[PDB]
Amino acid sequence: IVGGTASVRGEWPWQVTLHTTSPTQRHLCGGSIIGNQWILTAAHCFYGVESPKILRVYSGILNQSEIKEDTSFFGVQEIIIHDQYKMAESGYDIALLKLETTVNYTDSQRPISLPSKGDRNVIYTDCWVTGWGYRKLRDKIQNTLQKAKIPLVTNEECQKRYRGHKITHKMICAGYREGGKDACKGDSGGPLSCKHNEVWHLVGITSWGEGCAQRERPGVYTNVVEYVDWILEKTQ
Ligand SMILES: Cc1nc(N)ccc1-c1cnn([C@H](CC2CC2)c2ccc(-c3c(-n4cnnn4)ccc(Cl)c3F)c[n+]2[O-])c1
């Protein structure tokens, strides 16, 4: 996260850190708890992943330094990538992880609601991007989960900034015209979380952008509302 600040314990209890353990253990991507057995993340995260055997899902984590060899994690029983996914910038950047067993929810590990039926024309004005990613294009993974408030941009404005890509209704853009706050490397797969009527909804999945926090180049997110039917079919 560029231009962000540190979170405190319990603040974003649906945020997970997905680790790979091949060839060594490291944070790979963010994700969001959406059910006792289900995480929603980005398909691009699995580009170099040979199988679900090497993944570990950690929940309830504020600082990466909390994870040690005896820290409990959930195994992944299945990775479900959207069948039309090709590359992040052309869309369909969405995946479900089915866990081996059910998370009992606690104060530190809680679900976020999907965008609700009836809310298709809500204007979200309180949206946040969170993650352990870089603070600038060449940087490092941060220890403490970071947060930044970012405004949504219309698809019309977003397309004018990205005339070499197809910005469709299945994407949502967010960013300031002057730049300065945005996702960056290591935040993909995590949530763009928007609060409406004091309930959090998973509006976007962090996906791609030109640079990080550059002027007139908003971040691009998978528009989760457009995938609700796909999610319900896969989870049932
Ligand atoms: C370096 C590293 N170290 C780790 N230990 C773990 C993971 C990584 C690493 C390197 N790239 N990525 C991902 C893709 C990859 C998982 C498949 C990525 C690509 C793009 C963006 C992005 C940008 N960016 C444009 N230019 N940079 N960022 C701007 C706006 C938005 Cl909205 C964005 F989503 C964010 N991420 O995370 C992760």
| Domain 15-111+230-235 in CATH 3.40.640.10 | no
- Find the catalytic residue in 32, 59, 188, 193: 188
- Find the catalytic residue in 93, 193, 196, 201: 93
Query: How far is it, in rounded angstroms, from Cα 7 to Cα 14?
Result: 13
Q: For residue 162, which amino acid is it?
A: Y
Give residue 216's Cα distance to chain centre.
Answer: 22
215 annotated to a ligand binding site = no
- Find the catalytic residue in 27, 44, 196, 201: 44
Q: How was this structure determined?
A: X-ray
Alpha helices per DSSP H over the chain? 155-161, 228-235
Resolution stated for this PDB structure, in Å? 1.5
Query: How far is it, in rounded angstroms, from Cα 206 to Cα 218?
Result: 12
Catalytic residue flag (residue 82):
no
Query: How far is it, in rounded angstroms, from Cα 195 to Cα 46?
Result: 29
Query: How far is it, in rounded angstroms, from Cα 193 to Cα 129?
Result: 7
Question: Using a CB cutoff of 8 Å and minimum separation of 24, what contacts does 121-127 make?
Answer: 122/196, 124/152, 124/194, 124/196, 124/201, 124/203, 125/151, 126/194, 126/195, 126/196, 127/151, 127/152, 127/174, 127/192, 127/193, 127/194, 127/195, 127/203, 127/204
Give residue 126's Cα distance to chain centre.
Answer: 16
Phi, psi of 152 (to 5 degrees): -70, 150
Pocket of ligand 1 (CB under 6 A): 26-29, 44-45, 47, 133, 141, 182-188, 206-209, 211-212, 219-220
Catalytic residue flag (residue 93):
yes
Residue 118 C-alpha to ligand 1 middle, in angstroms?
A: 33
Catalytic residue flag (residue 44):
yes
- R_g of the chain, CA atoms, integer Å: 16
Residue 210 C-alpha to ligand 1 middle, in angstroms?
A: 11
Pocket test for ligand 1, best of 208, 217, 220 (most atoms within 8 A of CB): 208
CB 123 within 8 A of CB 196: no
**Best CA proximity match to 115, nearest among 236, 213, 197, 25:** 197
161 annotated to a ligand binding site = yes
Q: Determine which residue's CA is closest to atom 8 belonging to ligand 1.
A: 186
CB 194 within 8 A of CB 173: no
- Residue 76 has a CB neighbour count (10 Å cut-off) of 20
Q: Determine which residue's CA is closest to atom 3 belonging to ligand 1.
A: 186
Atom number in ligand 1 closest to CA 184:
28
